[model samples]
Target chain A: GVTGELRRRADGIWQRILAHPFVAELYAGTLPMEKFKYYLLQDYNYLVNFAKALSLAASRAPSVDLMKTALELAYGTVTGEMANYEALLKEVGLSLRDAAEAEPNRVNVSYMAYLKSTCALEGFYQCMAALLPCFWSYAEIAERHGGKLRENPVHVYKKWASVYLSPEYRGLVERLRAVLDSSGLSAEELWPYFKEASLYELEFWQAAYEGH
Target chain B: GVTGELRRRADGIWQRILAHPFVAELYAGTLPMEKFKYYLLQDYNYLVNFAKALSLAASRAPSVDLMKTALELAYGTVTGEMANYEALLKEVGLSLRDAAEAEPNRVNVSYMAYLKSTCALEGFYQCMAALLPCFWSYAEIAERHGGKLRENPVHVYKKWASVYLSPEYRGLVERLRAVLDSSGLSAEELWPYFKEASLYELEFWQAAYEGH
Candidate 1:
């Protein structure tokens, strides 16, 4: 219920991000090879720092259940979502080394900085609130975009979509939503972190096809 | 061989740490109640950030097997290791709430910063190298101290000792050590991360009993 309000507050940004051509193009399986390579590389970098932020929040969880949720999702983010990138990179004739050495775009750096900054400047709850959208929206995007995968048997984007849209990922989002709702922070306190992260989510997609 | 050398390098610090009266006091169940409470609280905070750094490293693991190892360990650190802390704290007359609310000492903050900075500034392999010492040595300390738990059936420190020295924790560490040895880092390169984290491991207990 609370995460619903949290989502409503950022509906426009979420809409823009979900509707971004990057998502649409991937969904349609019409995204260019170069752009997909570019996106995978950048996305890998994002997961690097995002995992860092999630762990920071995890270290300070006040409840066992919440800590468990954060760890599982954090584990999934680093291993599962990230494995998709590595596999995709290999699929595209690239290496994670490229992703490792590549310069992170403005959006990637800004998003990571925002997440890490929250960890540095705030406490556990606020940072978790800030990170909720990234986890939440990825699953949502995967659901809407992954539907086309069944038709394109050889689709490059199918794995990426399925990784995000899979029941496991959606379960994480739903659990995270419940965790956020249980946190009991006032809307005023939670809104900014959610709002700032939502904007970064939009920037991430917009920059997926665009570059530095 | 690399991990063996890693253990050798930290042998003195680990010796000093394990031999310290603080650990003996805990083993004997003669530690000040106040100190145990203090340690449990601070220890919880350490697990919080430690898990974060582990997940950060997991996100970019170059190989699938390594990624799997990192995820399972990361999950264990957050859930199993942390659950141990929760139960220990509960046993010692505190809750995760008390741990969550307590102020971390200089060592706890610095240690977390060091590990996380490695993740963001360095690459996955390097950061994981830095993280390995923490996991390995906790088991070492538990082994040395937990034996008394059998005689003094009500030993307050038994479960805490049981956690690190437990089969689950040892299995995780051995697997992790094997994983680290399998990594091809030159001893020259891996030594510093191993050394830094080991000193922090010492500081973690040293500060736990001694800090504000």
Candidate 2:
């Protein structure tokens, strides 16, 4: 409910996000491998902080169920499910070690910093609001373009798209959205974080395409 | 022409910009003086880079007329019209030196950096495309809210709003838009810079409101 309102308000940005050359090219199987590789490295580096922010959320969770939900999400980022990411990176001729050693662009680091600060300084609901856009957008992008996958010949692009389209990925997004929707917070209270993160999500793609 | 399309595409961001608490409060004369002071300081620092970016455009201008247009615009920022900014700062109880000494937030620095890089690395048309959003949005903001000035009892807010609505300010925005519109560059070629700057414009306010 609250998230739907946030998404409706953010529709303009979402249009831009979907129409961005990087996303369009990826969907068309025309994005340069180098740009996709750069995105992967940045995505890999981002996962480190994403995991940390989730752990912070786990620590701040008011209930055991919420705590485990956060940790379960973080666990995938930090542990076993990383094999999926590792495989994706390997397909792009990179390694987890390379990702570990990569320098994040200012936008990438700033976004993670925002999430970390909000999660640490604000309450559970606020943290989830800050974090929801990343998952929500990835799933949205995949969902919007799923049918086009058959036309996209790029294996890495197809694989990446499928991850978000997978039942597992949609589960994470829904869980986050459901938490925020059911959190008893008003739209007025949670909107700032949601809005900020959505803009960051748009900039993240812009940064990747711009090579910074 | 191209500028209209860019603005139309950026409508979502523009809506958010107008609806932002900082803007809403400022328009309503309810924003804290401290927040207004922060914005003025950041705006002052941004003008330095804004002027430099204009100078860069002057250097790359292919025609004497375009060169003079850019130089004239730069002159206002670097010399005479700074008095207006000085007055705004004074009314808010700050000085040019204070603005100079103040550390710009990351968003501020990053936005200026983007402008600088685009102006330096790109051609004259591309430079103006990047620069249009800053001026265009300010004028649009004032025009949209000028009728509310009477309701806003805050003297400083009314004064700041008037500057953007002034003939001189509108002329600058019109001149820039006309140049881009007549530049023969397609929207496809220019939308990236316009979109990036528009997002930065939105973030500039967000950064101020967030106190970062």
Candidate 3:
């Protein structure tokens, strides 16, 4: 499938993402509370934009079935994924206001702009290409780190990791993968969008890791 | 009331707003349909940001009652007000995506930034102060232009004008007025926020008039 090919080309970036200290320490239960809080806050903001971008894709969908998929994904991001982040934020003594009012760091600002512009200006296929990495990478992270989660000492970290490890979550990733795979664009056409978003995934982790 | 005093001092701007060609043309059913379309598209984007700012205000509300009011206002903006604009856009041969994907004009971009920053950075009182002009002045515009609407030939323009003239909308303006009046700030202290937002209202009209 084209999505498989896109993922194959981006494997190098994805490996580094899994190796990043953010995921490393998270697996080892050595991540700092403050750093985890920062991740929660930033991810909260990230999902808000992600949801909006999905709405744009839904609005632009060529078929009612595709629109249904995009709208459902958007709704889940808002209600399900974000609700989890909100709960974690509360557990860490942060409020939704902290996430809402806090200025997103430079990387988040750029990343969100990329998603919004791509979804707004590009075709439905391109929009799906731009969004797939975020959904796909997380499930991979959970798969790679699932054993470590069982041994992790931090309860909050355990809870956070479990979200991405869920069967339902994995299903959503496949849904997105199927959507992108259905696009008949050559890997060359799809590669640029996939690669850039993949790179942003790496930067997203590093930003949260380095306290940006 | 503090809001009354703020309005008194801004009477000069209010009169200018009432006399603006945009308002005059719409009232007289002479507004170019293209310009009216521009206004609808820009205002659709404006209300999205406006709704976010109101949610910020809701989050920062000092009491449950105040939070309820702010949230209700936010809900109404998204559901009632935006729905109206959506239907109007459809009437004018446009769609929600047209508004969603269109870049907000420069005036709108700055004006939204102003509202968002004021709501996020300032106290609740200042947030309400910054927002009052948009709410209050629309009701006043309808009152001032009601006679003209009765004589106008353009059904769309008359329909647009009637939204502001409704008792329900006027009640909302009063509700906002009441919220700001209860803030206990003296007129001198509240003047800056009020003045800036009021100026934006006039610029907002001018931007729509000139097809920015």
Error of 3 at B197 (Å): 0.2
lDDT of 3 by residue, A89-110 (tens): 8888999888777778989999
Q: Give residue A18's error in model 3 in angstroms.
A: 32
Give every prediction's interface RMSD.
4.2, 12.0, 9.1
Residue-wise C-alpha lDDT for candidate 2, range B1-212, written one tens digit per residue: 98899889889988888777888788888889888988888887799888988998898898999999999989988776688899888887899899998877769766876787567657899989889899999888888777778899999899888888899889888888899888788888888788778888999999888888
Individual DockQ of the candidates? Answer: 0.27, 0.02, 0.03
Among all candidates shown, the one with the greatest lDDT: 2
lDDT assessment of candidate 3: 0.82
**Winner by TM-score:** 1
Scoring the B chain of model 1 against the true B chain gives a TM-score of 0.92
lDDT, model 2, position A9: 86
* CA lDDT, candidate 2, residue A15: 78
- RMSD of candidate 3 to the true fold? 9.3
Per-candidate TM equals: 0.67, 0.55, 0.53
Candidate 3 has which clashing residue pairs, if any?
Answer: none
Better of 1 and 2 by TM-score: 1
| Candidate 1 lDDT | 0.77
Candidate 1 local lDDT, residue A31: 82
Judging by lDDT, tell me the better candidate of 2 and 3: 2
| TM-score between candidate 3 and the true structure | 0.53
